[PDB]
Amino acid sequence: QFEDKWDFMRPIVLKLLRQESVTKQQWFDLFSDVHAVCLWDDKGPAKIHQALKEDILEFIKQAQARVLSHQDDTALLKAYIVEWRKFFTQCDILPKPFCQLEITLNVEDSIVRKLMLDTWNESIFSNIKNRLQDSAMKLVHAERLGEAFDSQLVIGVRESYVNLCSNPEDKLQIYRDNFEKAYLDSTERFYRTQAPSYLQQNGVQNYMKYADAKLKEEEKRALRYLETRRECNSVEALMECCVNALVTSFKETILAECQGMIKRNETEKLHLMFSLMDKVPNGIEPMLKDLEEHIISAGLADMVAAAETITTDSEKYVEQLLTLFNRFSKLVKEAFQDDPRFLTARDKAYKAVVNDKCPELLANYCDMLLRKTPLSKKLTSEEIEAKLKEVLLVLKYVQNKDVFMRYHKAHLTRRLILDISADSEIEENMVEWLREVGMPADYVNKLARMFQDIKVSEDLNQAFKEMHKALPADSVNIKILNAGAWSRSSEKVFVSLPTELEDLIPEVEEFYKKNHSGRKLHWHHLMSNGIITFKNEVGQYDLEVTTFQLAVLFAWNQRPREKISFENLKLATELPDAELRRTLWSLVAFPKLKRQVLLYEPQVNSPKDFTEGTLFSVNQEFSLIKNAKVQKRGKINLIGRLQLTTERMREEENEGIVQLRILRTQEAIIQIMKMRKKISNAQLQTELVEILKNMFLPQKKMIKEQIEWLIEHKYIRRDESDINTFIYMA
Amino acid sequence: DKMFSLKKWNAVAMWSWDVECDTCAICRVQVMDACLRCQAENDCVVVWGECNHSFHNCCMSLWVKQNNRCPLCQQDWVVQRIGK
Ligand SMILES: [Zn+2]
Ligand SMILES: [Zn+2]
Ligand SMILES: [Zn+2]
């Protein structure tokens, strides 16, 4: 029975419990006798645990004294650890001589081991415990103060907490519930005290740096003072606690810093913040907001202000938009570590910037860049393209893409009629560029067609340059264009031409008809221009003038000193007052000239100042002036704006767009209804918005009107039970 | 050797289909006047095809529903311009 075997076992058991030199023979004497106890004595398994409890307790009490006696908290832990190590060692050794006990009452689940761990707690680790913990925490505090005590003292304590609760059901019960708890009590307490002491005198960024540093140090302490054996998970929560207690609390001020850093593009300071506030469950999200706000505000501020100063300054419009894009793009790439959330905040905000709303201006601006303007003359062909390349972004954001393209195309048409592009390639680039934006092929293709048409027109031109030998063929360049596209309007300001031209046109028409049967010319003299040698008393100067001006000037070909009235010129040219006045004005008041082509009695400031009785004559003193000297020959342009885009044309294009929107909407409805035979207004409107999205945003009012039309014209019909539901008809 | 001796002329003109600026062809009212539907149930405006043929937008839209080709020739239809 137990009382027969235990007397031989105990001595050995004690040695196991005191970590003494248990011999192999003793290992087995005990082991064999352990089995005998459990087998022979029905209560053996219990008695052996009891005797063990007593033997264990004796050791534990010795250990307690060996630790407890040390009123010095650190000496205490040193002793604790020492005793602990011996204790733990036996915890893992004893179950071996006692396998038979553990099997009858698995050395891993060892009941004795449990009793040992429990006894340790009962006498030491759940009482001197108070000091074990206070000490460990004072030491953890020391590590935080800078008093980097030998980490092992706290680690040791933690190892004990963990091992004591090694029970597989909750291997971290004590550790987590008490050590991590205490850790946090000390962590938060320490830093809830120090984190403010820091900021109290330190700047926000200084604190933030300290804070993050503290967090890194805490990660190290977590690897040391806290457990690493397993995933732990709660250990992360502890880091979250550090953040919350310290950083999130402070976040209330850090976000103010965010806004400031954004305004100054202080990406490094904001970079730190990004990381720190990302850790803060409710920090980085407000930062997203701040970014969005600044970008939109910049639009409402920087973009809009620019637009007002810009008028025609395309470079600034373009660059300002793109400067903002890039300024903030950079910010996000650095300050916000290229994080998709900030990229999105930016994307949305900037989209607003772009739509904060007149693509028609952007179009005018692209024209300025593309064509040979004083603006474009300062740019290398590559720079012109580059600016546009960046503009791609703007247009992608622009909702009403059709607006931009309408105006752009209107400008292209003109550019190709007059050949006033910066160069040829920039035009080709622009077309491909629009494709790069992702713009509607309808417009982009038409632009491409404009170039193809010029090619065809020039084939014809060449024929005339070779055949007409009124003038020396070659001298004339005739562009016969596709009216359906090039005749942007029905504005055909017919003008009576010089004999040299009037006697040519019949041949142009003749030849044209002989090769273009079924076709009809539209003599768009308005866009026609040419060069005449201006014979003066002082010399011979070529003039680059409009066809209308040629007709005006024609009046004096054989009589330079005769006065011809405004009205007589009107008649000679068969012009309307509006155009006549404009062309005359240039002839008698073109900018930058020291000499005007025509002289006249009353003077004008602007075209409107001419009167029917205004007499004009040929400026026989006309000359290209150089260094204030009269040249014997030269060349002067008197066209300028006479052939350049007015509020009238701008509005005509505007309505044209509106009508296109209407037409496309109506067609889209039909297409949708063919696809889905019966759908709600919501479904219809949704699909319409999507289909037309790459051009513009459809308005429900317009859609409604198109629906009514389509109903009236039997393309669709309303559902008998729902006026919002439509059914394809016919 | 006249006062303004022609040296160069950059002539610009467009072309369209000849016959006469008459009727609409689908319908038949003057291309510049109201169309079968407006002038009767009273904005009938104009539309062009890449083929340079022009009709009232209202007449060519109705026709395109039977087949998407130009009434006069028979090439695939494509709006060139809606502007007047
Ligand atoms: Zn109509
Ligand atoms: Zn046709
Ligand atoms: Zn018609």
Author numbering:
A (entry chain C): 14 to 118, 129 to 379, 403 to 515, 520 to 780
B (entry chain R): 27 to 68, 72 to 113
Sentences copied from the publication:
The Cullin 5 (CUL5) Ring E3 ligase uses adaptors Elongins B and C (ELOB/C) to bind different SOCS-box-containing substrate receptors, determining the substrate specificity of the ligase. The 18-member ankyrin and SOCS box (ASB) family is the largest substrate receptor family. Here we report cryo-EM data for the substrate, creatine kinase (CKB) bound to ASB9-ELOB/C, and for full-length CUL5 bound to the RING protein, RBX2, which binds various E2s. ASB9 and CUL5 behave as rigid rods, connected through a hinge provided by ELOB/C transmitting long-range allosteric crosstalk from the substrate through CUL5 to the RBX2 flexible linker.
We determined a ~6 Å cryo-EM structure for the full-length CUL5-RBX2 complex. A strong preferred orientation in the cryo-EM grid limited the resolution of our map, but we were able to partially overcome this orientation bias by collecting data with a 20° tilt. Despite the moderate resolution of our cryo-EM map, both CUL5 crystal structures could be unambiguously docked into the cryo-EM density. Using these crystal structures as a starting point for modeling, we built a complete model of the CUL5-RBX2 complex. We were also able to obtain a cryo-EM structure of full-length CUL5 bound to RBX2, which has previously been only structurally characterized using fragments of the N- and C-terminal domains of CUL5. Interestingly, throughout the entire core of CUL5, the amide exchange was extremely low, indicating that the three helical sub-domains form one contiguous well-folded structure. In contrast to the low exchange throughout CUL5, RBX2 residues 41–47, 52–58, and 62–73 exchange over 80% strongly suggesting that RBX2 has a flexible tether that could adopt many conformations bringing it closer to the substrate. Neither the HDX-MS data nor the cryo-EM data show any indication of flexibility within CUL5 as had been previously suggested by simulations. Our HDX-MS data reveal that the strand connecting RBX2 to CUL5 is completely exchanging suggesting it maybe behave like a flexible tether, enabling Ub transfer by a ball-and-chain mechanism.
